[PDB]
Coordinates of C-alpha atoms and ligand atoms in Angstrom, one line a residue:
X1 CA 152.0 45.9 81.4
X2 CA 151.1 42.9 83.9
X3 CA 147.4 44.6 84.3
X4 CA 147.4 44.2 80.6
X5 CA 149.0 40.7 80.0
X6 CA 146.7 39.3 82.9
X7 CA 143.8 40.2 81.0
X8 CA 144.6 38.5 78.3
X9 CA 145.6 35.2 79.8
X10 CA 142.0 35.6 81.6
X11 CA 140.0 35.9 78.2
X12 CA 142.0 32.8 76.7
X13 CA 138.8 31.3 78.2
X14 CA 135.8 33.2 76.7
X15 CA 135.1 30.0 75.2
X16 CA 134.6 28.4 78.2
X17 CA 131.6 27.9 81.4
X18 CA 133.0 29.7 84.0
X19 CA 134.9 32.5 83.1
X20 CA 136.3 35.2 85.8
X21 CA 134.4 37.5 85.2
X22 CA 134.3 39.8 88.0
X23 CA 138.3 39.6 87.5
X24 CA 138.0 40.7 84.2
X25 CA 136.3 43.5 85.0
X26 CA 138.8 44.6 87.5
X27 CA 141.4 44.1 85.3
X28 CA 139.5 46.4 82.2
X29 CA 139.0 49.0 84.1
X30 CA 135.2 48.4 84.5
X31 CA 135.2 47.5 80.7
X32 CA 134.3 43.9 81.0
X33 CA 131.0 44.1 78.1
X34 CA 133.7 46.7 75.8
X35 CA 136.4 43.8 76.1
X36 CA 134.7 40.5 76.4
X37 CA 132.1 41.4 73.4
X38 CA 135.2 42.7 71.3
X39 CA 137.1 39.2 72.2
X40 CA 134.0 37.5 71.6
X41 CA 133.7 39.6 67.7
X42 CA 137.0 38.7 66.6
X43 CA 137.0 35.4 67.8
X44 CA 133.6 34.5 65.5
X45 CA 135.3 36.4 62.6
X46 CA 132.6 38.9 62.6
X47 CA 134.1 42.0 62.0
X48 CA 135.0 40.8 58.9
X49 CA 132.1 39.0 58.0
X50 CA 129.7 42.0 58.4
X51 CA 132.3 44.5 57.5
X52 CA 132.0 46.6 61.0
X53 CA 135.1 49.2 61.6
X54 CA 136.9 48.2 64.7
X55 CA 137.0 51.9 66.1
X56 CA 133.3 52.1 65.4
X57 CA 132.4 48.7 67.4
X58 CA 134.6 50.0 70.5
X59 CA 133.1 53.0 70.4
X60 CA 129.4 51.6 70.5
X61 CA 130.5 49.0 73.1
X62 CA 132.1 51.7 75.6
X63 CA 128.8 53.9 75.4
X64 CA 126.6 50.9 75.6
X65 CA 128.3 50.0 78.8
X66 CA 128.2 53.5 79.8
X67 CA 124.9 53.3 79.9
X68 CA 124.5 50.5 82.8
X69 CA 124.7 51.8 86.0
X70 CA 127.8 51.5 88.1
X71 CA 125.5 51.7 91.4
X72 CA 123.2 48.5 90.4
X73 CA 124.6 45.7 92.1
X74 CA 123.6 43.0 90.0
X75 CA 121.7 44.6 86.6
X76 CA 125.0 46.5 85.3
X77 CA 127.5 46.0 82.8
X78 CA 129.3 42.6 84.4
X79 CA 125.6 41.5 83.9
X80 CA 125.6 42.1 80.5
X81 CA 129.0 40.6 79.7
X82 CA 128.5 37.4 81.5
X83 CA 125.2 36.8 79.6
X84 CA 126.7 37.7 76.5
X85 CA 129.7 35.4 77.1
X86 CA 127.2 32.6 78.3
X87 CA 124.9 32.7 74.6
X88 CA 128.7 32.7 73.0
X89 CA 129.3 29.2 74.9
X90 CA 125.9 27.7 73.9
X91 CA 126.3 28.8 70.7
X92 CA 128.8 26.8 70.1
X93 CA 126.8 23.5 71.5
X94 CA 127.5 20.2 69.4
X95 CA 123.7 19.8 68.9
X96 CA 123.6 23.4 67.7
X97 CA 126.5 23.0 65.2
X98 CA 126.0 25.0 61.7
X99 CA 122.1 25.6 62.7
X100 CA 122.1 29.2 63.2
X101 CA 123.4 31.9 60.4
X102 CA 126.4 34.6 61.1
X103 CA 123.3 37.2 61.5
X104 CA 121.3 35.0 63.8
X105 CA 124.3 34.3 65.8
X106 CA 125.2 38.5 65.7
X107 CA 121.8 38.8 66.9
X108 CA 122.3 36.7 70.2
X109 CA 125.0 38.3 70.9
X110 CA 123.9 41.9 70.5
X111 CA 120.6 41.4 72.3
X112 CA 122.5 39.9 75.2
X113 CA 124.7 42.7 75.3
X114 CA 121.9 45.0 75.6
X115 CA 119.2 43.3 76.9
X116 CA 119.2 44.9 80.7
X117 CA 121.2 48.3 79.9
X118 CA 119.9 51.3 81.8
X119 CA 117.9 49.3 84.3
X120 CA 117.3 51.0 87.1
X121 CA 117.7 48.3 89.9
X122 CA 113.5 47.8 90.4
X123 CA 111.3 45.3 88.8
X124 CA 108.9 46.1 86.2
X125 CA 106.2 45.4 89.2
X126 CA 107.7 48.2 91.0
X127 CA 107.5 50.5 88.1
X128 CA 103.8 49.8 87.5
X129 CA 102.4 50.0 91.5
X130 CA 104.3 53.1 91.7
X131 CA 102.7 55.0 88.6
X132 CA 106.4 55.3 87.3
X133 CA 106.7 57.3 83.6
X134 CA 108.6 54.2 82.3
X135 CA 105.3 51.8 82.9
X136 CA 102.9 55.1 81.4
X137 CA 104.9 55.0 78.2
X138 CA 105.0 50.7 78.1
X139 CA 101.2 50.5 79.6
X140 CA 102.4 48.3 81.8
X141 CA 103.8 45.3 79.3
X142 CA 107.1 44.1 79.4
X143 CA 108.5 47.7 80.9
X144 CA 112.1 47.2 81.3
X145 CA 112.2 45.2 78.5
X146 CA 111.2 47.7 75.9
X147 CA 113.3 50.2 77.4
X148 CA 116.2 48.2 77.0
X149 CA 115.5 47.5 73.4
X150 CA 114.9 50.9 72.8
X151 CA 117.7 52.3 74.6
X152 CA 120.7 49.5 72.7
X153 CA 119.0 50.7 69.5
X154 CA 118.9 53.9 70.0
X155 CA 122.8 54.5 70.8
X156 CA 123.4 52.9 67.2
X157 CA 122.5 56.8 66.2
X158 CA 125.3 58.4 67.8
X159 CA 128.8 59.5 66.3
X160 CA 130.8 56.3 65.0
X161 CA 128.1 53.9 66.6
X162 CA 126.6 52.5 63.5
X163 CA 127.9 48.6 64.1
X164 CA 125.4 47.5 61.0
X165 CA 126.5 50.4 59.2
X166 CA 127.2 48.0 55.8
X167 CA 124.8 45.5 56.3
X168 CA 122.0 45.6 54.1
X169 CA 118.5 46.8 54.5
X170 CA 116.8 43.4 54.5
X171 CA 119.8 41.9 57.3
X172 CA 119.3 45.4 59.2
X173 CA 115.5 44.5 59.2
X174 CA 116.0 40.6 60.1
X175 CA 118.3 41.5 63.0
X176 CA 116.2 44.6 64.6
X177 CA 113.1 42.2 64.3
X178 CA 115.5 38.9 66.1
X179 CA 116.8 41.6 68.4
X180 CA 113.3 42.5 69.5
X181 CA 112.1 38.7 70.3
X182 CA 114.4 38.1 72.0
X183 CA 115.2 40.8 74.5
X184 CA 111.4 40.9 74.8
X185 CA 111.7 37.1 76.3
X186 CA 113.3 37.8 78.7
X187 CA 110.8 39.1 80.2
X188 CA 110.1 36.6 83.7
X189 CA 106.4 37.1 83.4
X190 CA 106.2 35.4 80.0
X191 CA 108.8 32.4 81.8
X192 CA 106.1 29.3 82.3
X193 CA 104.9 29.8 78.3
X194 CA 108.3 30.1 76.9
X195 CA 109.4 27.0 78.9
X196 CA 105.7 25.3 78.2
X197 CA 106.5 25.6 74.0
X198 CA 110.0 24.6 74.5
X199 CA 109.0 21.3 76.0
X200 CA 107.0 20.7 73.3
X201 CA 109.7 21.4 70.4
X202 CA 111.6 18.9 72.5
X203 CA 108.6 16.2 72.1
X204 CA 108.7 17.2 68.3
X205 CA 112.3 17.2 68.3
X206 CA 114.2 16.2 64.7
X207 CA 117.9 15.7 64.5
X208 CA 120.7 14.7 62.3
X209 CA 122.4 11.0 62.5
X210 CA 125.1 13.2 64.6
X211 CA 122.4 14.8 66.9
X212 CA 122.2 18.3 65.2
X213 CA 119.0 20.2 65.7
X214 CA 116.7 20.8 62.2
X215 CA 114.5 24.0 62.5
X216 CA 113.6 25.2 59.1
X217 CA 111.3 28.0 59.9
X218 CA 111.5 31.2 61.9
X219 CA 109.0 30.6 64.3
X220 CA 111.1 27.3 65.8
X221 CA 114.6 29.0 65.3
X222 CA 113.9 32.3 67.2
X223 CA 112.1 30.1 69.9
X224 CA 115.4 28.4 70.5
X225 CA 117.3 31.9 70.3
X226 CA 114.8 33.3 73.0
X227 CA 115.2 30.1 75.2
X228 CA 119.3 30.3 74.6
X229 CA 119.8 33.5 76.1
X230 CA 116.5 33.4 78.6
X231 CA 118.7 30.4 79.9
X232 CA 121.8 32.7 79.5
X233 CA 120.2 35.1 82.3
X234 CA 119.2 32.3 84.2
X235 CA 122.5 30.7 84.3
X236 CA 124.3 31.8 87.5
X237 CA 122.9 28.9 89.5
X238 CA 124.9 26.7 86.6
X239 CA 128.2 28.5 87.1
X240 CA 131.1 27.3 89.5
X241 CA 129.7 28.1 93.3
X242 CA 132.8 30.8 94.2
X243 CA 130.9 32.6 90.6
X244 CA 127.2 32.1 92.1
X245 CA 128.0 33.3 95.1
X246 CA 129.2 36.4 94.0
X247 CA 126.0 36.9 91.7
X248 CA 123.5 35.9 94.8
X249 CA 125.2 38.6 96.8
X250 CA 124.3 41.2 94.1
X251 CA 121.1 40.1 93.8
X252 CA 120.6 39.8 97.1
X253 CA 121.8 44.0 97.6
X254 CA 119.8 44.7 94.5
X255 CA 116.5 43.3 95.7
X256 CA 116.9 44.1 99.2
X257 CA 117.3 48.2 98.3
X258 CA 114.1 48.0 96.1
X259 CA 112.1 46.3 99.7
X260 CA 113.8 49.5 101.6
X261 CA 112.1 51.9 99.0
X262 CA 108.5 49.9 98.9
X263 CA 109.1 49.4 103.1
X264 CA 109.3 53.7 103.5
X265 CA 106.7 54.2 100.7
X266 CA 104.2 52.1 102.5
X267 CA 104.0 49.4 100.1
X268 CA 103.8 45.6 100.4
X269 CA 107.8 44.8 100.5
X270 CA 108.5 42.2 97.3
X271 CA 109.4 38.5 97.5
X272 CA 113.2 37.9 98.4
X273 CA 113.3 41.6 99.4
X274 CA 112.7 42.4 102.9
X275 CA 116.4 42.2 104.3
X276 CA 114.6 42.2 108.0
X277 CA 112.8 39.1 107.1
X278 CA 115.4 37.3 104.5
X279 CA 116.3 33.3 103.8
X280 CA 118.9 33.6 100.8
X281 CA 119.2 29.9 101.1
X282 CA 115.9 28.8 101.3
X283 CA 114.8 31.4 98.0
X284 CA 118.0 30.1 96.1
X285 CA 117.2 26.5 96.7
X286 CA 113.6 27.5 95.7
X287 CA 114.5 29.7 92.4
X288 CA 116.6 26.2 90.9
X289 CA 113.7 23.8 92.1
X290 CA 110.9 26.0 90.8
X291 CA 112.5 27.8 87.5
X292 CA 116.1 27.3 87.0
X293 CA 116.3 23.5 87.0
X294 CA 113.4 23.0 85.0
X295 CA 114.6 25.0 82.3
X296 CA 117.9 23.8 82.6
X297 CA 116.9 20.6 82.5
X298 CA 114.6 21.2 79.3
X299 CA 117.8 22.8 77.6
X300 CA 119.2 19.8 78.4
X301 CA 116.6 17.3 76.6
X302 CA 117.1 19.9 73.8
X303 CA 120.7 19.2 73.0
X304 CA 121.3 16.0 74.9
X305 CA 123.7 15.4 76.2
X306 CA 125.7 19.0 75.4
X307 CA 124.5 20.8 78.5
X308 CA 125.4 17.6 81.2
X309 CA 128.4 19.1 82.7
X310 CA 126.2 22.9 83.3
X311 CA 123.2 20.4 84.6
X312 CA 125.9 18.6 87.0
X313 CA 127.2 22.1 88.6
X314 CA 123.6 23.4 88.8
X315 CA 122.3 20.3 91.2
X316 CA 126.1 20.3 93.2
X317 CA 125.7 23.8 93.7
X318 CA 121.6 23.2 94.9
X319 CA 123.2 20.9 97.2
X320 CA 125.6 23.0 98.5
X321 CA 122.5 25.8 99.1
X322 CA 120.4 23.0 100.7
X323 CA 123.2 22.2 102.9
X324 CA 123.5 25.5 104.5
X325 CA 120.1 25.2 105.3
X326 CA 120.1 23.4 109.1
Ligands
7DE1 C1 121.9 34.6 91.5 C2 120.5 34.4 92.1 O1 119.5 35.1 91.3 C3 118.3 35.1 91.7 O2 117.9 34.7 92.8 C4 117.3 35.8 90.9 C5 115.8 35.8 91.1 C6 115.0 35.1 92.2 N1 115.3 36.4 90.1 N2 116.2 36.9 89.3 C7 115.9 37.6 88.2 C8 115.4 38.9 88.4 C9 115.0 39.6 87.2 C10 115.2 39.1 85.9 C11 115.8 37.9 85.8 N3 116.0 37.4 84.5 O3 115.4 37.9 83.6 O4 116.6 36.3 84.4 C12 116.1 37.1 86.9 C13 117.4 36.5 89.7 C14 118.7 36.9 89.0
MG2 MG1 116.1 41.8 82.3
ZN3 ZN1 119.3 40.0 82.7

């Protein structure tokens, strides 16, 4: 089938910054998380290496993905698989080069996977200043965060969903407790702290002859794990400007149908979500100046000089922003 042989061709570059995406999940039938995290498994040998039944990992993937919602413009399922495929890409960064462990690398992945599913399209803000049951049960911490968490986890229960099925208690343990730092990360209200302690590892920074990072203990290796994939979901100002686009308009749709609910409910209508009273541009050029870039460029320092060519597309593309702007 051409529908079939086209998809194929168009995951030959899962290893790569950049990937179509959104034509992937045209071509999948909606199924871009199911078919880029099953490339993304074989490719890293990990079926084999954690003994998971193929049938039972397609079956997880396709309910996980289920459970985004088609009608959220940006926090849905491509979301998912483009942050998934992005922590596959800098896993594989020169400086990061036989640091991390087959688990610790299955735990990137799966968190990233799950880490917005079932979000509802608000922000955990709007959740708490309108009494919302998801912000009772969190008390008001990390809201969609925990839910997500909770939610990935909890459709490992149903019928052939088991992924970790043979791994052992104490890896099942180690993951669920990676799995739970991170997601809980990504969290934008802990941003400036996780940024403040990763400049620091990069002041303490110790490498190989080669450049290779050293972290010995967990505290230091999950840090760069929560940073990895928090720059993962901040990484569509770093993609090719036709891809960026695409993900401001979602955004964009997203944040602008949360300011219509606060507008008709009377409440003070969020930052970048009034559509009467917008500047995409401006608030673009302002989210890489004021927490893209300087993460970015932190990453950077980190694994110098690994992440040059995502640093280079990230100011072109600012440019490009800033040119629009008359
Ligand atoms: C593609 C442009 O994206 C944005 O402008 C933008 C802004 C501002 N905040 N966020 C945003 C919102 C909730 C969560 C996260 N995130 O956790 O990375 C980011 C995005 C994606
Ligand atoms: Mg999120
Ligand atoms: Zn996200």
């Amino acid at each position: 089938t051409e529908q079939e042989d086209v998809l194929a061709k168009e995951l030959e570059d899962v290893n790569k910054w950049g990937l179509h995406v959104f034509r992937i999940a045209e071509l999948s039938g909606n199924r871009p998380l199911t078919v880029i995290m099953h490339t993304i498994f074989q490719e890293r040998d990990l079926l084999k290496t954690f003994k998971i039944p193929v049938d039972t990992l397609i079956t997880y993937l396709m309910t996980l993905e289920d459970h985004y919602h088609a009608d959220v413009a940006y926090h849905n399922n491509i979301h998912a698989a483009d942050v998934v495929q992005s922590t596959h890409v800098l896993l594989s960064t020169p400086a990061l080069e036989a640091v991390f462990t087959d688990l610790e690398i299955l735990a990137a992945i799966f968190a990233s996977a799950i880490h917005d599913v079932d979000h509802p399209g608000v922000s955990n803000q709007f959740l708490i200043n309108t009494n919302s049951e998801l912000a009772l049960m969190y008390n008001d911490s990390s809201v969609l965060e925990n839910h997500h968490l909770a939610v990935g986890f909890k459709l490992l229960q149903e019928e052939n969903c088991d992924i970790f099925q043979n791994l052992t208690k104490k890896q099942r343990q180690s993951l669920r407790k990676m799995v739970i730092d991170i997601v809980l990360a990504t969290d934008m209200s802990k941003h400036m702290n996780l940024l403040a302690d990763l400049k620091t590892m990069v002041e303490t920074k110790k490498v190989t002859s080669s450049g290779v990072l050293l972290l010995d203990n967990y505290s230091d290796r999950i840090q760069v794990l929560q940073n990895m994939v928090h720059c993962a979901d901040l990484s569509n100002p770093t993609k090719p400007l036709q891809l960026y686009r695409q993900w401001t308009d979602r955004i964009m749709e997203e944040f602008f149908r949360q300011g219509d609910r606060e507008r008709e409910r009377g409440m003070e209508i969020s930052p970048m979500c009034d559509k009467h009273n917008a500047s995409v541009e401006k608030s673009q050029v302002g989210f890489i100046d004021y927490i893209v870039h300087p993460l970015w460029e932190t990453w950077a320092d980190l694994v110098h000089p690994d992440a040059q060519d995502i640093l280079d597309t990230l100011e072109d593309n600012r440019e490009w922003y800033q040119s629009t702007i008359p």
